[PDB]
Amino acid sequence: MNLEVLCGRINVENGLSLGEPGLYDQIYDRPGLPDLDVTVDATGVTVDIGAVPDSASQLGSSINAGLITIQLSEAYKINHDFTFSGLSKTTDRRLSEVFPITHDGSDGMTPDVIHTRLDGTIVVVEFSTTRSHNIGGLEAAYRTKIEKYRDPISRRVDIMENPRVFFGVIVVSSGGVLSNMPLTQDEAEELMYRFCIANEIYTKARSMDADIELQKSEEELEAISR
16 A cells, blocks of 8 residues: 555646545455454553454455554554554654645644645645444544645645645545545455454553543544644
């Protein structure tokens, strides 16, 4: 899963585009989860991931079996970080490093991706997950990202010449993906399987340290606006 390939699948002619949302429901014959043993201590979360079962769909091809550790201070966002690690070429750039400074309070907003393409198009992408199994939950996460970033980016676009900016949102849940980045069904299914593993790991970690849930709640709360 490659970030440049994904960003190449959108076209913005002039201005700021929010694309078209598309729903990818879960339809593959999905394999079971791999064995996951989770131990939580002051170092952080240690996970032993078994091998992904075989299946015709071949889902899980992005899962590395073996041992991994997440520092406890970041366990709260396991669901995010594990689901999208294949796409998180993380440098964490702020808007002002690609957009004109406006001093409107948003210059320091850091989306998951800011990528400039060879043709000059600027693609800002935001990743999200929800544990709800209801279409409203997917829609809520997606709307929340749209509302967080549309006004700042639109303000920036109004004071540029020839801006071609696309704001992408990908929301992954157990039962579907909602995205304005065009995906293949296989890519969406792999994201959903990764999320299933991530949520199992997170649930196990939270059973030993409940405070991470609180951290998750507060942190997404602050992420509503800054």
